[PDB]
Amino acid sequence: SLYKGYLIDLDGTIYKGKDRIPAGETFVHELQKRDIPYLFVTNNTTRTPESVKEMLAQNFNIDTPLSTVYTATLATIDYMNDLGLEKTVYVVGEAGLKEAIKAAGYVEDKEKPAYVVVGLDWQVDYEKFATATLAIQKGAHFIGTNPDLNIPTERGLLPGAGSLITLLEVATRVKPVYIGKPNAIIMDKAVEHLGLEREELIMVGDNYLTDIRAGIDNGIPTLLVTTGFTKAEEVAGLPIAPTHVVSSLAEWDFD
Numbered sequence: 001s002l003y004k005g006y007l008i009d010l011d012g013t014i015y016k017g018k019d020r021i022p023a024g025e026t027f028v029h030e031l032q033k034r035d036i037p038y039l040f041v042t043n044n045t046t047r048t049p050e051s052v053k054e055m056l057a058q059n060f061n062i063d064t065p066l067s068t069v070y071t072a073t074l075a076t077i078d079y080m081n082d083l084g085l086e087k088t089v090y091v092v093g094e095a096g097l098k099e100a101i102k103a104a105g106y107v108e109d110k111e112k113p114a115y116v117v118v119g120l121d122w123q124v125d126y127e128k129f130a131t132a133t134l135a136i137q138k139g140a141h142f143i144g145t146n147p148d149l150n151i152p153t154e155r156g157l158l159p160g161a162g163s164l165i166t167l168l169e170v171a172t173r174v175k176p177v178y179i180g181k182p183n184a185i186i187m188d189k190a191v192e193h194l195g196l197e198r199e200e201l202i203m204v205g206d207n208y209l210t211d212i213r214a215g216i217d218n219g220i221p222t223l224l225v226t227t228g229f230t231k232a233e234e235v236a237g238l239p240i241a242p243t244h245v246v247s248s249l250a251e252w253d254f255d
């Protein structure tokens with residue numbers, strides 16, 4: 001076990017949509033049995049950290065602490081607090097995202113906010129986009145929670161946060177600061193959470209462009225499970241290959 005810590009993706013890796021992935025569950029159990037420090041890191045902001053925990057326990061037999069569920073939302077609020085601009089903001093996204101933003105020191109300002117935070121909003125519409133545009137044009141710090149252009153639902157690959165964010169980008173001509181995988185911002189705060197050296201850490205995911213590249217671009221060993229986005233047929237043909245590749249997490253052990 002050259003790896004002391006584990007950064008784990010959720011959708012497509014530990015489970016698939018509303019479906020189970022028994023192996024992924026067993027994998028988490030081993031990590032728990034074996035006393036190994038792990039951290040779940042997801043880009044999805046439409047579900048709060050505590051809501052994840054709930055889902056995991058009631059749907060995928062995983063009983064995990066709250067501190068082990070790192071969402072792109074946490075990394076975004078951390079970032080905002082780090083930058084320290086005045087605490088005014090305009091948000092496009094789901095209630096959870098907004099609830100936390102204001103739960104921190106940020107009050108909503110529709111005209112001249114210091115920050116404009118954009119995440120996936122299942123009910124985004126024109127008015128919200130126009131409000132966001134004007135705010136960003138007037139100089140607000142444009143933040144995109146996660147780059148994902150698509151989000152898999154039990155309905156297909158619908159528009160993800162990235163697409164909504166891109167619309168505001170080409171409408172304000174202002175490039176946003178992406179928080180989620182595979183950006184350094186969330187990964188730094190994640191490596192910091194486990195407080196372990198990237199050398200002895202490994203990121204596990206099903207998506208090359210987000211999970212895998214999250215390690216490559218940030219110097220962190222990677223494990224790719226072709227149970228989700230990146231299909232096995234394409235494992236050979238990727239830019240920088242993943243440290244380890246596997247068709248199922250049941251092919252991983254001690255050393």
Ligand SMILES: [Mg+2]
Nearest residue numbers: 009011012207
């Ligand atoms: Mg995924």
